[PDB]
Design a protein around this ligand. Structure first.
Ligand SMILES: O=c1ccn([C@@H]2O[C@H](COP(=O)(O)OP(=O)(O)O)[C@@H](O)[C@H]2O)c(=O)[nH]1
Ligand SMILES: [Mn+2]
Length: 232
């Protein structure tokens, strides 16, 4: 079923920021069906205003998460002022995870001490929140990886290079049960200001009543610069 409960309604007590949840996506139908209402629930109990954007890559190039996140940033509503780059299959179970506006610096929700798998100090993946100003300060993510290498560690380099520091949950006592987990040297130049794309369609989707926006994105690839985008 699809009724909308009361606690999904916003009021003046939720405060002033609004989160764009940017979900890069390919063939994760099953996980999405759990994810959209899970997050609507989780965030709405925490009084976090949000909109969820499923970034659906429908060109026939290799899957380029980073490039998709750049598009999500660019296509998200101007009423959102921070983003959460958020894997579709990592669900937060702990109400103390801070998905609030990360004013001091990028906030890595899925820290290695909390992730069910990954465990190294500069692991930057899974769930990462930045203010739109900070994401712009970093020039967003590299578009050049096309699924190869570690686009996340390159992002960590952009964060430090921009003068920012990274913060992580403190005082969290659940462990590898904090989340439910459902189951390359390129040029440094470019990112948010060089991503090329178009949106083939936008679709309003409700999942048991919980809304999200599906963006069907066609990324362009300059095959002379990154021929390997075709290598799929
Ligand atoms: O073929 C893919 C690859 C990944 N993703 C998205 O990118 C995230 C991270 O990719 P994946 O979980 O496959 O790798 P991991 O982050 O666990 O190393 C996923 O949670 C999805 O949101 C996707 O939807 N389809
Ligand atoms: Mn995963």
């Amino acid at each position: 079923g699809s009724d909308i409960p009361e606690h999904w309604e916003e009021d003046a007590s939720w405060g002033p920021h609004r989160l764009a949840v940017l979900v890069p996506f390919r063939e994760r139908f099953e996980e999405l069906l759990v994810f959209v209402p899970h997050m609507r629930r989780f965030l709405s109990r925490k009084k976090i205003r949000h909109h969820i954007y499923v970034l659906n890559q429908v060109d026939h190039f290799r899957f380029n998460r980073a490039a998709l996140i750049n598009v999500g940033f660019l296509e998200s509503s101007n009423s959102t002022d921070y983003i959460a780059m958020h894997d579709v299959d990592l669900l937060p179970l702990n109400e103390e995870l801070d998905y609030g506006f990360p004013e001091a610096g990028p906030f890595h929700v899925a820290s290695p001490e909390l992730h069910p798998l990954y465990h190294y100090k500069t692991y930057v993946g899974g769930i990462l929140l930045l203010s739109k100003q900070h994401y712009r300060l970093c020039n967003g993510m590299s578009n050049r990886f096309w699924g190869w290498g570690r686009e996340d560690d390159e992002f960590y380099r952009r964060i430090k290079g921009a003068g920012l520091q990274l913060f992580r949950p403190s005082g969290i006592t659940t462990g590898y049960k904090t989340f439910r987990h459902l189951h390359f040297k390129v040029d440094r130049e470019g990112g948010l200001n060089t991503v090329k794309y178009h949106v083939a369609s936008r679709t309003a989707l409700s999942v048991g009543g919980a809304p999200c926006t599906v963006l069907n994105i066609m990324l362009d690839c300059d095959k002379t610069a990154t021929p390997w985008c075709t290598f799929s």
